[PDB]
A paper describes a structure:
In the Gram-positive model bacterium Bacillus subtilis, TasA is the major protein component of the biofilm matrix, where it has been reported to form functional amyloid fibres contributing to biofilm structure and stability. Here, we present electron cryomicroscopy structures of TasA fibres, which show that, rather than forming amyloid fibrils, TasA monomers assemble into fibres through donor-strand exchange, with each subunit donating a β-strand to complete the fold of the next subunit along the fibre. Later studies revealed that TasA assembles into fibres that form the major component of the B. subtilis biofilm matrix, with deletions of tasA resulting in significant defects in biofilm and pellicle formation that can be rescued by addition of exogenous TasA17. The structure of TasA fibres reveals that the TasA system is a donor-strand exchange system in Gram-positive bacteria.
To gain insights into the structure of TasA fibres, we purified TasA from a B. subtilis double mutant strain (∆sinR ∆eps) that lacks the matrix polysaccharide operon eps, thereby producing TasA that is not associated with EPS, as well as the regulator gene sinR, an eps and tasA repressor, causing the strain to overproduce TasA17. We performed helical reconstruction from cryo-EM images and determined a 3.5 Å resolution structure of TasA fibres. Interestingly, this structure shows that TasA monomers polymerise into fibres through an N-terminal β-strand that extends from each subunit into the next. There, this extended ‘donor strand’ completes a β-sheet of the following (n + 1)th subunit, and in this way provides an extensive inter-subunit interaction. In addition to the β-sheet hydrogen bonding of the donor strand with the next subunit, there are extensive hydrophobic interactions between donor strand residues (F29, I32, F39) and the next two subunits. The C-terminal residues 239–261, previously found to be unstructured in NMR studies of monomeric TasA and not present in the monomer X-ray structure, are ordered in the fibre structure and form another inter-subunit interface. Remarkably, we observed that the binding site of the donor strand is self-complemented by a different β-strand (residues 48–61) in the monomeric form. In the fibre form, the previously self-complementing β-strand (residues 48–61) is displaced by the donor strand of the (n-1)th subunit (residues 28–38). The previously self-complementing strand then folds over the opposite β-sheet, and the donor strand (residues 28–38), along with residues 39–47, extends towards the next (n + 1)th subunit, allowing assembly of the next subunit. Thus, the fibre structure is neither representative of cross-β amyloids, nor is it a head-to-tail arrangement of globular subunits as previously suggested, but shares features of both, including inter-subunit interactions mediated by β-strands and an intact core fold of the monomer.
Residue numbers in the entry:
A (entry chain B), B (entry chain A), C (entry chain C): 28 to 260
Amino acid sequence: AFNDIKSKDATFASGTLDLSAKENSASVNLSNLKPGDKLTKDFQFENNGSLAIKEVLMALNYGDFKANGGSNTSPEDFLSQFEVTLLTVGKEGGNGYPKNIILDDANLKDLYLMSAKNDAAAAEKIKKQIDPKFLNASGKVNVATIDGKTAPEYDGVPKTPTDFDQVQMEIQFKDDKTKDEKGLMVQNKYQGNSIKLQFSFEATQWNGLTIKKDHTDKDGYVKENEKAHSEDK
Amino acid sequence: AFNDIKSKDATFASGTLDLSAKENSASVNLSNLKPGDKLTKDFQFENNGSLAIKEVLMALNYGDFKANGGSNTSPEDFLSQFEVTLLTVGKEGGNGYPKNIILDDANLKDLYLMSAKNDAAAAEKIKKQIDPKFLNASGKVNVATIDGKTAPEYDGVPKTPTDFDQVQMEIQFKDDKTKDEKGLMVQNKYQGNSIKLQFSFEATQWNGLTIKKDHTDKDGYVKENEKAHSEDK
Amino acid sequence: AFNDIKSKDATFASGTLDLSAKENSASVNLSNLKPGDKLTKDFQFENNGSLAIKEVLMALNYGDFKANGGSNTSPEDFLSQFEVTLLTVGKEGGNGYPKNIILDDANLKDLYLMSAKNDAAAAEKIKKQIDPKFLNASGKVNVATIDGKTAPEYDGVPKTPTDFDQVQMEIQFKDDKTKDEKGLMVQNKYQGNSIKLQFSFEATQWNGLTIKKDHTDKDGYVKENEKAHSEDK
């Protein structure tokens, strides 16, 4: 009836990831628009968590339709009259490519349908008129920098190399320009209409990583999780 | 399986534009006319909408031909016997030019043909006998003030500077004065003829404008859309 | 692509003028005349149209020459043997002048030549033997009342003041009284000759009038066109 007991110690901890997503826009809210006008919106993404981000996914949503004086009461019709002219993921950041236009004259009705409802036809049309490599199966659009040939480490706003990503979007109020036989043009129905837009950004983290001696620090913390390309094959 | 969501807000609104087009004429309807008589009509244009007008386009239409006792039953022949003597776009308004006569002894048959049917020959004849700078490809005649050297801001009845445009038109019943061999003059056929005229005014808005920080107000509303020369190059 | 349409209404009408020209003569047709005889013809002019007359112009024409038994076959020679003794434009009408004789022993050959053929010599002779103020460039003779100092409004048989104009003409068969050496007098050639006379009256309207607020009625009709002196300077 002889025995002995030996024990060992081991502590496990988990990291966190946060997204800043500052606006820095010129006006944020615009009113009294007329057809043919062009808008401008900016976004700045920075890392505020221990873990390293991989990409940021953009979603579009609407609400609070008013139709004060127009003859149109369908929010979808009003939203369909706004075309997003360009979406530059590079902007001021000179890492790798200075500026990159992933957009080719898209629309917002299609973007809403393929971003929230995940409609098949809208997704097909967007993929026909957008960069294929900036899309995901979920339907959202990647906005963070990707595939940096000069500096692969500056991919998906990591933390160990201090990186911030600036993106520009240009929104244009399309004019239809078709005159009726009576003499009143059809786009007159969108007079006084007001809509609210919801711009949602989702940040994801990389895949799993097999931890070895080199990846971790001298004791405790792992440094590889804070850097880009942390995931294994 | 870590992620986070960030959202942003944005509201878009559209403006409206309206035209007042008061008459203020002396008699509006005139009867018992005889050849050689001269008429007088007035019009006052004011802005009643959020957006800023660029020009007002005038159209002419007829209807309700009666021919009570005359031997003429063609409305075109009766309409061809009225010449519009003058069309003063300035009138009482002293902004820039006090008075400007854009018309040189025009006719109403030609005006109808080049204003509604858009006939090529009538348009050519009018352009030969009218001011070229007050015309458009659509065929209608601009009536609002334009090219104000003293005050460029008072162009096309804007809203931010309170402007109203007064226009006069003079209509004369032309006499033909050719006597037949029998002794009855030919213009006797237009005795008792009555016609109704439709004076249509169309107000258009400027072209697209690229919105920047200076153009918009402190928050929301844009002031540039309410002023003249809002459109870009 | 914003616009709006405004329209206005306007109706134009034209008046008519008619002449009554009743005869009221004693016998109308006279036969079996002999030299030295005197005739009598009357005319009454009234207004039967919306517009207001200015003057009535008289023309003379002949036809249907027979020469049953005379040795003269020229209608001109037979017509030259009738002298119109007097032409009173006043007659029973007491407005202003009761009676006015515009004629001084005229002839009918000269009247025909200066009224239809518009011969220069006949017109000169008539102007030498007629009142200059009752003539026109066309050559016809004004018959309606003119230049009424007491009542200027009763000029040229207007409509608003109910006026009718009565005119008398006296025709005398002149006797030549020259005896030939054989013993047969020359005027014997005009025996059995018969001629038909055409008395033509033309009514004219005033010149053009610039229509203002006072001239027209409350709505529509213009009253100035129904009154004398409607034309402007």
